[PDB]
Design a binder for this molecule. Structure first.
Ligand SMILES: N[C@@H](Cc1c[nH]c2ccccc12)C(=O)O
Lengths: 148, 153
């Protein structure tokens, strides 16, 4: 088990944690997670997960230019995208109750609700309060006590 | 348009195709493939592959700044990296017998031997003579029969 695989497992754990503080308007039987864009640490998510409450997280890659990301995804995990592509992605998410998390987040002021920082001894993450308010989903404010 | 799963599966087969025009100075029992940097299309690769002679290809992700890539890897499948990370990777491979293939078709100017173009109806690729010559492996020129017939409607 090398440190990319170990960081990937940790990435899984962190997302599961974050999920426990989010609520969807109409809660689905299976939580759809979409991995979108190039990613380095998503191989654990893609093996599928299960929440403490029993609900299954089904994970799948989807293309950046997939117009239906808003209706196909409950959670999106966003990898490397350029400017045109990210506002392409979020145009598809606008109007829908979707939790968004990006694998890299140097500053996290535009785009995803949450931005991981996977480098370093432990995984940390930042929260985008605007994104969270315009999100469609409900975020228990306790989750901010879990961020940097 | 082609799906992410479809494209992933095809990348597997194009890599198997390329591997068959490549000879290593000391062929290993198990071909070691390393996926480095963020990738969209490597999930097929990472299941492990098998060559037509029955040699297994073992795949795993490694960190961009791992100093021993040239030692740990027979093959590098390279994802999205910045200017400095790319310099790090290809300096790590200098002097070792390593095949390098990029997921995207921009890295053929900067050190990758083959560069995939995953857009379109089929997967095409391009190659760089300079990078190939300094690679330490031997590549048969027929490998372009595979890019040409792929670039064909
Ligand atoms: N090592 C190769 C070098 C080479 C010549 N022409 C090529 C065309 C494509 C790829 C490699 C080559 C050889 O057998 O000579």
């Amino acid at each position: 088990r090398t440190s990319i695989e170990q960081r990937s497992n940790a990435v899984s754990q962190v997302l599961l944690g974050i999920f426990s503080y989010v609520r969807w308007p109409k809660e689905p039987a299976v939580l759809q997670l979409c991995v979108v864009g190039p990613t380095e640490y998503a191989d654990g998510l893609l093996r599928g997960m299960v929440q403490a409450n029993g609900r299954r997280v089904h994970a799948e890659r989807r293309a950046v230019d997939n117009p239906d990301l808003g209706t196909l995804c409950n959670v999106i995990y966003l990898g490397v995208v350029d400017e045109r592509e990210r506002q392409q992605v979020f145009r598809s998410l606008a109007g829908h109750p979707v939790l968004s998390i990006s694998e890299r987040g140097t500053e996290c002021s535009v785009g995803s609700m949450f931005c991981l920082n996977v480098g370093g001894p432990r995984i940390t993450f930042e929260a985008n309060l605007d994104s969270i308010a315009r999100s469609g989903v409900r975020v228990h404010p306790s989750v901010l006590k879990l961020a940097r």
